[PDB]
Amino acid sequence: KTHVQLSLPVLQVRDVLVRGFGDSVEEVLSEARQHLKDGTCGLVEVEKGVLPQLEQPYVFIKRSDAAPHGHVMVELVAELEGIQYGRSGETLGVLVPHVGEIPVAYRKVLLRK
């Protein structure tokens, strides 16, 4: 399947134990896709002061379309030193490894895989 229905645990930035996926744009996109498939991926909603508390490169989920079965269609865009790799819509948040942090909510997405 080109798309997969996922329910992503929304984490508070100060709870996050592993604050990024790795050290290159290609590694963070790779690791993000692997964690999404393995159900070990969390989502941090972007506000003032969030991104400086997380590690670059960043992996964003961005709205790719205007929502099957409640699930917003999203794709991955990485960012390193103000340059993005990918072009997509509005940010739904930044992806991080999930290692058992208690979420505040769940975000239903349809991920272009």
Swiss-Prot record:
Residues 1-113 are annotated as: Disordered. Coiled coil: none annotated. It is found in: Host cytoplasm. It comes from the Viruses. Residues 2-113 form the CoV Nsp1 globular domain. Inhibits host translation by associating with the open head conformation of the 40S subunit. The C-terminus binds to and obstructs ribosomal mRNA entry tunnel. Thereby inhibits antiviral response triggered by innate immunity or interferons. The nsp1-40S ribosome complex further induces an endonucleolytic cleavage near the 5'UTR of host mRNAs, targeting them for degradation. This inhibits the integrated stress response (ISR) in the infected cell by preventing EIF2S1/eIF2-alpha phosphorylation upstream of stress granule formation and depletes host G3BP1. This is Host translation inhibitor nsp1. The gene is rep.
